[PDB]
């Protein structure tokens, strides 16, 4: 029996111990969260239903997300031993691996052509 | 079949290897064994446009079946006899191949018997 969560198969709420907690500390957090959601919902709806609106509704959360994933990246980058090692391996690693695949293969192909044991029968286009 | 559960789950030296048939010389046991006869000429099979799979020792019966089908068109049910003749010839050919498998199975039995006596 028993369900073991995984990152791609998460724990159900019904099996979550934190869903059955009724302590006033938690209930105050849950009420506080809904107050934030309700105020945001009200602001959105007042814009949405306003009969004088002429344009779409600006979405500051989406602007922050797209900003965080582009312009904000480099100012918040710090070279660390893990960054540097990862950058060098990811950046150059595949380049070196594929160099030896193509170089080794093409060296052998030339070796066979010089000494006549490459079967070029009908190959006339290249 | 039984032949598979004997080659496996048992000894295999007395059971034929399906790719190594015929293992023994053809004359062994037949004094003047006759070569198989082929009715259809190479030209006839070529002109009838038989596929190489179809150019076996029954091609003459296949050639009439094809001939009948072309003549009997549009009546596509009129070639029942010729189809039966071709099928029967292929059946005898198949039995012939069953005899060869049985012949080798018995020769390998004899080889195991006469080898035991030698030592």
């Amino acid at each position: 029996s028993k369900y073991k969560p995984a990152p791609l198969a998460t724990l159900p709420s019904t099996l979550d111990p934190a869903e059955y907690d009724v302590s006033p500390e938690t209930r105050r957090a849950q009420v506080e969260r809904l107050s934030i959601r309700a105020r945001l919902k009200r602001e959105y709806l007042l814009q949405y239903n306003d009969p004088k609106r002429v344009s779409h509704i600006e979405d500051p959360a989406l602007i922050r997300w797209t900003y965080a994933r582009s312009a904000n990246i480099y100012p918040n980058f710090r070279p660390t031993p893990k960054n540097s090692l990862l950058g060098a391996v990811a950046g150059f690693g595949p380049l070196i691996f594929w160099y030896y695949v193509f170089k080794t293969d093409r060296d052998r192909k030339e070796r066979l052509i010089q000494e006549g044991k490459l079967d070029r029968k009908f190959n006339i286009s290249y | 079949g039984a032949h598979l559960t004997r080659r496996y789950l048992w000894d295999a030296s007395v059971e034929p290897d399906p790719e190594k048939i015929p293992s023994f010389p053809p004359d062994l046991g037949f004094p003047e064994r006759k070569e198989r006869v082929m009715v259809a000429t190479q030209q006839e099979m070529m002109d009838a446009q038989l596929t190489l799979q179809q150019r076996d020792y029954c091609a003459h019966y296949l050639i009439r079946l094809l001939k009948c089908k072309r003549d009997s068109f549009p009546n596509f049910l009129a070639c029942k006899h010729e189809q039966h003749d071709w099928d029967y010839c292929e059946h005898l050919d198949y039995v012939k191949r069953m005899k060869e498998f049985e012949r080798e199975r018995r020769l390998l039995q004899r080889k195991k018997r006469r080898a035991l006596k030698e030592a």
Binding site: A6, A29, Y67, T80 | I21, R36, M46, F101
Partner: protein, 157 residues
């Protein structure tokens, strides 16, 4: 523009007063807000939100962003576009992730193993090889007419 620097993502919050200002920026509670670890990988103070796909958002609630199942104004997960309902699903399954992986690769490994068994113990009929006339159709198969073939003779059994 509307987005002043105080309304846009910034650098990692270093003081509890900067943590509070960041939480207010992202419409979160200070206790709920937490940034990514300070690794210098470019996250800054962007909130580190739980790794659940939008498949797990309540499908009956009337979300402002209907398809995304997001409300307007709430902070967007860093990998939202990976977690949209057209892409990666993290929703709970009736069977544990580990059990599915064991059964799937157990089934695959068993079948692959035992195709090999069927290869070394083939099924065939007690029949000799098919025979073809004319030196096994040497000319028809493309053999050179000039060179004499090696004779192949079949007998009547």
């Amino acid at each position: 523009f509307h987005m002043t620097k105080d309304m846009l993502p910034g650098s990692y919050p270093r003081t509890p007063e900067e943590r509070a200002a960041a939480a207010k920026k992202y419409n979160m509670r200070v206790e709920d807000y937490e940034p990514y670890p300070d690794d210098g990988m470019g996250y800054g103070d962007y909130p580190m939100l739980p790794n659940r796909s939008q498949h797990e958002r309540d499908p009956w609630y009337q979300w402002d962003h209907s398809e995304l199942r997001m409300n307007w104004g709430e902070p967007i997960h860093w990998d939202l576009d990976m977690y949209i309902r057209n892409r990666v699903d993290t929703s709970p399954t009736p069977v544990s992730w580990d059990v599915m992986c064991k059964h799937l690769f157990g089934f695959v490994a068993f079948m692959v193993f035992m195709f090999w068994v069927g290869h070394v113990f083939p099924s065939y009929q007690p029949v000799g090889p098919k025979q073809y006339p004319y030196n096994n159709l040497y000319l028809e198969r493309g053999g050179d007419p000039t060179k004499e073939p090696e004779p192949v003779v079949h007998y009547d059994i």
